[PDB]
Amino acid sequence: RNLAALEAKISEAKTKKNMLQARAKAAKANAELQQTLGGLGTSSATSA
């Protein structure tokens, strides 16, 4: 019974962390795309 509970805890913890890491990486990638789409070189164009 301890082994069955241990395997369940390991499996759930591993898969939950893996999908959380994947979604966190996707979320920060989208945030950097929106930030870089905002942060255009408008001051350099204005200086020209």
């Binding site: 962390k17 959380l20 890491q21 966190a24 979320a27 920060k28 945030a31 930030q35 905002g38």
Partner: protein
């Protein structure tokens, strides 16, 4: 999970910093874009 949660809180703080900064003219430009879309719908009604 606490290290990942600290990186999520850094993305929330980055989103708060962008949200207070990003007050721009572009909202009035989107109202002009919607007016231009209304002109294309009036041209579609004229074609119909």
């Amino acid at each position: 999970f606490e290290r990942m949660e600290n990186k999520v809180l850094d993305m929330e703080a980055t989103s708060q910093a962008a949200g207070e900064l990003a007050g721009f003219g572009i909202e009035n430009q989107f109202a002009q874009l919607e007016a231009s879309s209304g002109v294309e719908d009036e041209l579609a009604a004229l074609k119909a």
